[PDB]
Amino acid sequence: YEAGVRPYRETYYDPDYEPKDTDLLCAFRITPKPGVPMEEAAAAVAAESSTGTWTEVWSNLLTDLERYKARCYRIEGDVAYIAYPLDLFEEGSIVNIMSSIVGNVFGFKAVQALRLEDMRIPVAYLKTFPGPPTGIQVERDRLNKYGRPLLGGTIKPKLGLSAKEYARVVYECLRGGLDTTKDDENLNSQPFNRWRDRFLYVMEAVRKAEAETGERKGHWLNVTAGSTEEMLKRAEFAAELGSRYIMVDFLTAGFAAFASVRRRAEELGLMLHCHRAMHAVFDRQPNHGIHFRVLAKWLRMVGGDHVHTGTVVGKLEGDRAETLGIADLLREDYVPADPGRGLFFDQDWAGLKPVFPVASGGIHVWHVPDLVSIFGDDAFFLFGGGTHGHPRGSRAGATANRVAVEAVVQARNEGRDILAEGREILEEAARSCPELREAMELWGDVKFEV
Amino acid sequence: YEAGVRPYRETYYDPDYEPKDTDLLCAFRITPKPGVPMEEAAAAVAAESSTGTWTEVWSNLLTDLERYKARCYRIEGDVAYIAYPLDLFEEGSIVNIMSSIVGNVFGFKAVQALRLEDMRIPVAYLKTFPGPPTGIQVERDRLNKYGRPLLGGTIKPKLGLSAKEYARVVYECLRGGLDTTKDDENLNSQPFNRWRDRFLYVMEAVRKAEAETGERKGHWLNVTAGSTEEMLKRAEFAAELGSRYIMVDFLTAGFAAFASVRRRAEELGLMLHCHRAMHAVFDRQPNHGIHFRVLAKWLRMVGGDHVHTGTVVGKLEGDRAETLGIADLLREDYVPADPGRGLFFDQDWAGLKPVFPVASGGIHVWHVPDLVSIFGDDAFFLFGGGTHGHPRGSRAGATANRVAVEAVVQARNEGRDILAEGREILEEAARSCPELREAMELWGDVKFE
Amino acid sequence: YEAGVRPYRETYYDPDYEPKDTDLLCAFRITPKPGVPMEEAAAAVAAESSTGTWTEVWSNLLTDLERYKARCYRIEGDVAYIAYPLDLFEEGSIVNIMSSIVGNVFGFKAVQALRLEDMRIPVAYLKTFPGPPTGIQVERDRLNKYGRPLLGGTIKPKLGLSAKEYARVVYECLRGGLDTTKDDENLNSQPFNRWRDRFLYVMEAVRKAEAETGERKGHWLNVTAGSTEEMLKRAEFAAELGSRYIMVDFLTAGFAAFASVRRRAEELGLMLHCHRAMHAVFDRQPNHGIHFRVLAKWLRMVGGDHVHTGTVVGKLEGDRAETLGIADLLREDYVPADPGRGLFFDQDWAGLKPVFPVASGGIHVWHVPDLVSIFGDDAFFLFGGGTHGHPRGSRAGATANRVAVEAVVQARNEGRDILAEGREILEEAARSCPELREAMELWGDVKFE
Ligand SMILES: O=C(O)[C@@](O)(COP(=O)(O)O)[C@H](O)[C@H](O)COP(=O)(O)O
Ligand SMILES: O=C(O)[C@@](O)(COP(=O)(O)O)[C@H](O)[C@H](O)COP(=O)(O)O
Ligand SMILES: O=C(O)[C@@](O)(COP(=O)(O)O)[C@H](O)[C@H](O)COP(=O)(O)O
Numbered sequence A: 001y002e003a004g005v006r007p008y009r010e011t012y013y014d015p016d017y018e019p020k021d022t023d024l025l026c027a028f029r030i031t032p033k034p035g036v037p038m039e040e041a042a043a044a045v046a047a048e049s050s051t052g053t054w055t056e057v058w059s060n061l062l063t064d065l066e067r068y069k070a071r072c073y074r075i076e077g078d079v080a081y082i083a084y085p086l087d088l089f090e091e092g093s094i095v096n097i098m099s100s101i102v103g104n105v106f107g108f109k110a111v112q113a114l115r116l117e118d119m120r121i122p123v124a125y126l127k128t129f130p131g132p133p134t135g136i137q138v139e140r141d142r143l144n145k146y147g148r149p150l151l152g153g154t155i156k157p158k159l160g161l162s163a164k165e166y167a168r169v170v171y172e173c174l175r176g177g178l179d180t181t182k183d184d185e186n187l188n189s190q191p192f193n194r195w196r197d198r199f200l201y202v203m204e205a206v207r208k209a210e211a212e213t214g215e216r217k218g219h220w221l222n223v224t225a226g227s228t229e230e231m232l233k234r235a236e237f238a239a240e241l242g243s244r245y246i247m248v249d250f251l252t253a254g255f256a257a258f259a260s261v262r263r264r265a266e267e268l269g270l271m272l273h274c275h276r277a278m279h280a281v282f283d284r285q286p287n288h289g290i291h292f293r294v295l296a297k298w299l300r301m302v303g304g305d306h307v308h309t310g311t312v313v314g315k316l317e318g319d320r321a322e323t324l325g326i327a328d329l330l331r332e333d334y335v336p337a338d339p340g341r342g343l344f345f346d347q348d349w350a351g352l353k354p355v356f357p358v359a360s361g362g363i364h365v366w367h368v369p370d371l372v373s374i375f376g377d378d379a380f381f382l383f384g385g386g387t388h389g390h391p392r393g394s395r396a397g398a399t400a401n402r403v404a405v406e407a408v409v410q411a412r413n414e415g416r417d418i419l420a421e422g423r424e425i426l427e428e429a430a431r432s433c434p435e436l437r438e439a440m441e442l443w444g445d446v447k448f449e450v
Numbered sequence B, C: 001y002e003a004g005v006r007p008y009r010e011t012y013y014d015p016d017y018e019p020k021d022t023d024l025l026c027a028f029r030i031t032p033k034p035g036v037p038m039e040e041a042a043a044a045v046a047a048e049s050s051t052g053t054w055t056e057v058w059s060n061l062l063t064d065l066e067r068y069k070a071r072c073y074r075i076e077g078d079v080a081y082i083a084y085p086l087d088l089f090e091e092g093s094i095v096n097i098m099s100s101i102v103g104n105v106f107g108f109k110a111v112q113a114l115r116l117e118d119m120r121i122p123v124a125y126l127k128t129f130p131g132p133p134t135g136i137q138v139e140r141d142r143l144n145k146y147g148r149p150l151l152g153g154t155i156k157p158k159l160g161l162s163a164k165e166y167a168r169v170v171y172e173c174l175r176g177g178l179d180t181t182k183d184d185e186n187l188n189s190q191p192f193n194r195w196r197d198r199f200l201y202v203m204e205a206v207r208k209a210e211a212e213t214g215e216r217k218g219h220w221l222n223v224t225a226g227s228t229e230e231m232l233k234r235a236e237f238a239a240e241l242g243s244r245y246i247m248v249d250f251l252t253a254g255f256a257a258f259a260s261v262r263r264r265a266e267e268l269g270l271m272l273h274c275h276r277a278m279h280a281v282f283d284r285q286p287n288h289g290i291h292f293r294v295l296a297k298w299l300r301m302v303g304g305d306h307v308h309t310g311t312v313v314g315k316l317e318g319d320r321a322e323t324l325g326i327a328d329l330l331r332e333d334y335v336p337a338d339p340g341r342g343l344f345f346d347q348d349w350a351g352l353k354p355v356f357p358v359a360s361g362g363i364h365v366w367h368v369p370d371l372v373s374i375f376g377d378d379a380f381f382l383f384g385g386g387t388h389g390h391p392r393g394s395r396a397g398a399t400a401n402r403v404a405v406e407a408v409v410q411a412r413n414e415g416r417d418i419l420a421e422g423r424e425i426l427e428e429a430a431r432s433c434p435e436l437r438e439a440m441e442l443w444g445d446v447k448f449e
């Protein structure tokens, strides 16, 4: 035992280490404090996230740190790779991954900025998580919808509508052609709209709309609440009414209470829509935070049936190539590394079920050619403002978005180029769908930069 | 119904609105997309965090948005003040606040960067929250420790120690002078140290140091787990073992599960230490994210007996002026606005109990003067590497830290200037404390900017 | 789809397949029906224990059997190696392992005799099991006994003693040196000895001997019973009586109820002793059955704190080399393959706790040199008859055994060869121990091949 401060890089930087198939790997993009070498910055991350602290302790000899310590085994410019033994992590606890990988190391003076770019979840650890409760293939059997993207839309205004007027919009939306509707992430239970009331009005509207159109419907009822018990209570009520769905804000509620809801959802036979509220607070800026592809893996492991992935072309920021990767990370059984899409590691999913990507935010009919091209069939397209903002109301807007999606799908199956002939495909449909014509006319000049 | 895309400013920018005592106020620091004027950007965050979306909708006429919409009532350079009516929020739900205020507005193409600097929790809303379960005064009475900062320390290595060897460190720590010790934030239940074993071994050590020193002791037993149900199971076991505390990572576990644990800790009589793991993931950079003072207000509203606030002088980043303001926001009944410390609003706490600030990370004896100067008596100082890193082990290092604290409080009470005579005071105690001398020699050249 | 019976070898024998680190591997010894070639017989076992049946089915095309079928990838004489993909199994179910591997493949007219020799449990599957609740090291801490084999003994007669007289024997065994005692495997709750009476009488005998000797003591109360709820009910009662241990016949009770009891034992703080009654019904003959080492692996996966391993030199059959390999499987973190000890695969235990080997059956003082040399310190030695059969009763027989173990352990630590000087070491101790001298004379001609 030699007591004193020694640089982190003397025990937590091993550029000869060969990662094991059981190790959990991370890809950090580091911005050292000027004068702190990259090696010392990566080693301090590897140390203060695993087993080390700022000085040598006697207790380090009471154990075998050669077996448990994390190691930075590679450095490519400002990107550090760190390998974590399997025995460091509690089984089936995303809460434990985060408490190690992103617990304290983002606030060290020596590291001025840090972003977790990607994480390789090893198979032996993945077998400790249940994955989504339903999945794409089962859910498509419960909805009896095959061969196209699924249509949805958030009810607007976000807040302010009574429970009755709320379900009146839902009803106009569903009967008009939308497969589903949802509560806004910030609509939980408020003086103007209490949850029990909204749950009772909405299911009436959901049943009524299903009965008239003959197509199965659903409304993503938001059980997000200030406690675990309250969310489980609201999920219990949603099932007693026959809802196929509930909705949770998995980041604002938190991964501990998210897991609790996910387990109850399966027990109740509910499908679990997942809203990524708060993700932009730490997955937006390239120099600091946690990329969303890491949050998506965590979401699939815990088990969400859908999760928002972005629109690229809409009102919220989303890089295309990155989104194309995140979609495969959510849907595929094995995703190989692809620097072109930001995938730093291969990702074997060990048989877990796939998650529905959801494309929401400031989209309309003109975006459907791009949206079908980006996501394919296995995804939801949500038109909130693009539905209720139609000159003639929500039912007229729902019809327009449904005909637009089905028109673009049919064109692709026929072999047409939906990106070149997108306008022509939409204009053809408009010549027999006044709802679509009016929709196109209104939002013909509404574009966001990509 | 006039359909079409309208600017967010036409309805969500009202520079004449007088904020109400019942409104929830937010101070946002905005970096608009070039070409997007400031007023519009501020209006986009107001609209999309309350009632509005990207285009007009007929259903806007089915409610009275004049009563419910959020409004940017003031702009000062790149700082936008936005008022939210009281009816917008669910009673007693931090999760709801976060789902509005920070839900989607941080990811809009029009607002390149956005940081929430401060939030005014109106009293009528604060009355829907319970506050800490124990508080400072009751805690100190349960511990029978008065007149000084309280000593603590995280057991090291963070991970790897068997239950047996881990509690032996604990025993040496509490025996040597520490009041408390704690499970590292990332120590939950792992193959090398399962939570049931650790709880049993550790509490034996606790009861054994308490009996040998005569002083009441405690260990912060981390119940953080992958699910709520599991955290409540472990909080139950800790209570059955006569532990005075439990510990939880409230940000990684999350605010919904955190509320579940806080409620059970009171029912069980446990005091609740809270670790802010994950905070620097969105409170570090000054142009984007959420300042920690806001996270500290929410913490106090749900009910944490302590929370980490940083050290200023330690290894982790933390600003002195700001940190002073976060200490008051945690301990005082009322805090007036203070641009120098980053307090954008007056904050009445409506009779909620205070929270213990905790200063931990990369600190040693040479920091004790500054620390006592910054926080005073009502605060914990945790020495992890500064206790186990001593030349003679945890026992000796814990005596050096306990002695350094009591020597700086004694001098402070005698009228000395514990900053000007910081070195002298410590050297006087070292005359009577060989442990302290070794601790000062070892880390004499270890500083942080 | 070509309907019809096709040989198993066409789709279930792939000698070019390279096993993966996630596959589950099996070493079968096969005795084909005369005329059935080894490849076909091996393919049968692989097929009928994974995906196939006696004829082609149209439903084979509704899935990718290339992804889920088992494959006999290697044959070495009469030994077939079969790899099973990881998806075929249910996470955390030994029951599911047995339903597949040993469910129907042992009764086929095509395979006259089939013996499972060994099984490679992949790390990715081991991480779905908890392992032992307590483990060797935590168990020694609870007893505060270190650095020697631990003494035990089965109360005799197996059946017939009243709860009173039963606990009288227990007291005379614990007071006289033995660290523990145990119910017999077939002693559950009977008209002559109901379980509640025995539980109350015995704990009085445990507490009384712990106070007269100053050493911690324990008794292995058999909770085995006709249903899972009855076993759990008896465990709860054992824990309310302050017992450190319960006992369960994990093979006769079954792996499903075993897992139920094991989960409740940890929840109740109970150390779990596991008797392997019925093992010899299907691990004795070398041409048919399941070798015990496979059962030992499952035991440690579910979670036993001890399990019997045989004595080698006692009254029950047991091979020395194989037993040595079984001990390593029960105690070590990684066991490399070793054809000398019948270990067909490397076994990585992925951090699970170790299991105490237990040597019982027809052993007396003269066997202590061999037993120590075979097992080392981490092991229980059980002397049922070897204790009560002492010329002067149980108290005297317990002392004679406790001294023989401690006198052989002291000699080994001093450097002596406890095998060459086994007789001498015991006679030297018998000088200061009459009880040991009397036992050595009594059984001086009792030997088992
Ligand atoms: O709050 C909103 O703006 C929405 O209701 C969209 O409204 P419109 O449908 O009227 O645009 C969705 O929550 C966002 O799209 C979420 O963004 P992400 O999916 O990127 O989390
Ligand atoms: O993980 C660590 O580094 C610590 O155990 C400190 O150990 P030393 O005291 O031995 O450095 C604490 O968790 C940090 O201080 C928390 O940071 P904050 O105080 O910002 O929450
Ligand atoms: O029933 C018996 O014979 C015993 O009580 C031994 O009595 P003694 O101590 O009087 O011999 C044990 O259960 C057997 O040794 C078990 O066999 P195994 O060890 O093979 O499981």
Ligand SMILES: [Mg+2]
Pocket (backbone or CB within 6 Å): A154, A184, A185
């Ligand atoms: Mg929304």
Ligand SMILES: [Mg+2]
Pocket (backbone or CB within 6 Å): B154, B183, B184, B185, B186
């Ligand atoms: Mg820590």
Ligand SMILES: [Mg+2]
Pocket (backbone or CB within 6 Å): C154, C184, C185, C186
């Ligand atoms: Mg027996």
